[PDB]
């Protein structure tokens, strides 16, 4: 382990056989600055400030991931085709700010110990699926080389409105349901 | 019954201490969750971490242009980008929203950066506090509870010129 | 115009 006032990943390069799929992002002090949409060849900054004052050429992400794809192919042969082990994720649901009935809030669903980086995070309101007002972070790195993803749900707090965070991963024996009610 | 997956991660990390004085880089080449090779600027050469690493670290160390780029990345990556953080990220200061709602809980929400100190008449010694909560949208959270006159919550954060006090009754 | 962010490049595994 290394200790410092600040830790930045410039950046997090991920490529895996399942899909195949890749991820390119930069992090600072544990928060994601941006990600590159590898299909749209576009840099997506995570703050209005970054969008207004910073710039990353997406062409460098794509080229990096191309080398990862080459590297993975070589190392699969070297490791005598050793596949990834599935980890059990840890799901936590909590609000963004204090709950006030009739005051727009955000439910935060933290999914930690993701490995491999393949996950389905969804929301439920009174047992039924919710797509309206849902958004999530990219896979965020960890020192142990597992990941964490955070999912959000904008909602209006009310009585007779129970919430759930449904997580699907190969590390689980059944889809994890993390409940939340105010 | 689960799909087969082979994962590869390349992590180019920068460690900053005492402004621009101390700077250290570590590049990590990971097969699944196993880091097999790395270049630490303090070492100054690619090192094999696991027996999967010698064919890559020895090869990279034999190529001058690979060693020269990796070494120069302390300047072309770490130092370059820290000046870009200085003007944006490091000047980002979001003041917390402090409220008390009855066990009396003082909720300190949506603040940036991490550096926070919360105190609770005179200050008490029997308070249960949450660890620092990372919301993931560049804002933090911390909740301080207290068991069982005027009750006051004292919050100190770099964004504030003076600590924010919230009273009860 | 905003200065372009720097980034590390992965070293390429030996093809032979």
């Amino acid at each position, epitope marked *: 382990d290394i200790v410092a006032d600040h830790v930045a990943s410039y950046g997090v390069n991920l490529y895996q056989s399942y899909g195949p799929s890749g991820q390119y992002s930069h992090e600072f002090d544990g928060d994601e600055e941006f990600y590159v949409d590898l299909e749209r060849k576009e840099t997506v900054w995570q703050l209005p400030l970054f969008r207004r004052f910073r710039r990353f050429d997406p*062409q460098f992400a794509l*080229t990096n991931i191309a080398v990862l794809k080459h590297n993975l192919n070589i190392v699969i042969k070297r490791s005598n085709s050793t596949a990834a082990t599935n980890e059990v994720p840890e799901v936590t649901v909590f609000s963004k700010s204090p709950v006030t009935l009739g005051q727009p809030n955000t439910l935060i669903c933290l999914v930690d110990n993701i490995f491999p980086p393949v996950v389905n995070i969804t929301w439920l309101s009174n047992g039924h699926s919710v797509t309206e007002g849902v958004s999530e972070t990219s896979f965020l790195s960890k020192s142990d080389h597992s990941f964490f993803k955070i999912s959000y749900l904008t909602f209006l707090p009310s009585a007779d409105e129970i919430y759930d965070c449904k997580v699907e991963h190969w590390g689980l024996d059944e889809p994890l349901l993390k409940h939340w009610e105010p | 019954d689960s799909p087969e997956d082979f994962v590869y991660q390349f992590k180019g990390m920068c460690y900053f201490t005492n402004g621009t004085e101390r700077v250290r880089l570590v590049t990590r080449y990971i097969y699944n969750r196993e880091e097999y090779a790395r270049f630490d600027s303090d070492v100054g050469v690619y090192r094999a971490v696991t027996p999967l690493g010698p064919p890559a670290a020895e090869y990279w160390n034999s190529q001058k242009e690979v060693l020269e780029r990796t070494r120069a990345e302390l300047d072309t990556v770490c130092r*370059h980008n820290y000046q870009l953080e200085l003007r944006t990220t490091l000047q980002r200061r979001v003041e917390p929203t402090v409220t008390i709602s009855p066990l009396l809980v003082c909720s300190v929400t949506d603040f940036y950066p991490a550096q926070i100190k919360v105190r609770w008449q005179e200050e008490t010694t029997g308070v249960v506090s949450t660890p620092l909560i990372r919301n993931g949208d560049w804002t933090f959270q911390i909740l301080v509870m207290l068991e069982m006159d005027v009750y006051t919550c004292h919050v100190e954060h770099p964004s504030l010129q003076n600590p924010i006090i919230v009273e009860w009754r | 115009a905003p*200065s372009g962010e720097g980034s590390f490049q992965p070293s390429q595994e030996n093809p032979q």
Partner: T-cell receptor
Amino acid sequence: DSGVTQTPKHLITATGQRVTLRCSPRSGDLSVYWYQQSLDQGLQFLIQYYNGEERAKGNILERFSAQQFPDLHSELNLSSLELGDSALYFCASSTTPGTGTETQYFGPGTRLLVLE
Amino acid sequence: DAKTTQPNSMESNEEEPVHLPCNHSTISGTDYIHWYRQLPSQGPEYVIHGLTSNVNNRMASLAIAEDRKSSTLILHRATLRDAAVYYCILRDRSNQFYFGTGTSLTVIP
């Protein structure tokens, strides 16, 4: 010299014809580049392939197309030839897709002359 | 994005040093300085490259100004074989080469 070979060395063709230029990179080199050096526009970059897939594009015309096979050799195909396409076509190779310290090794070129 | 400027031609005397200047005020912290040479009608060939520190090799030397706003290619003793077109190119990660017009060096005996 540089280990990069190119065929044919010289080429004379008429207008409206198609030509296919071949390029063998250096052993071990995984990236291939195509440049066009004319009197009119100088040395211009056309296209870059890496591990058989397109990696970079310059101001290449739709009637210009390239490929990189599993043996990493490359082919530049020039269709519907015009007199202006009369130039020197260079191919280059490099180990990786490129870094700030990495050298590009160039072939001897193909002299293409498009006549009426 | 950042481009270089050079003299279009230079005439040097044989056996005398050659100092080929390059200008790049707009250089980035991420940009390396490269020099390539091309004899007629052969392909370009690499000479030297650097970042901030002055570089010396068999072919030539490279002087980079303290502010990194200019550089120089040094041939310590001109030869008739040195007459060629010299390209000062900026390189960053995997971005493409831009040769530009260069300096046509002619050596006189």
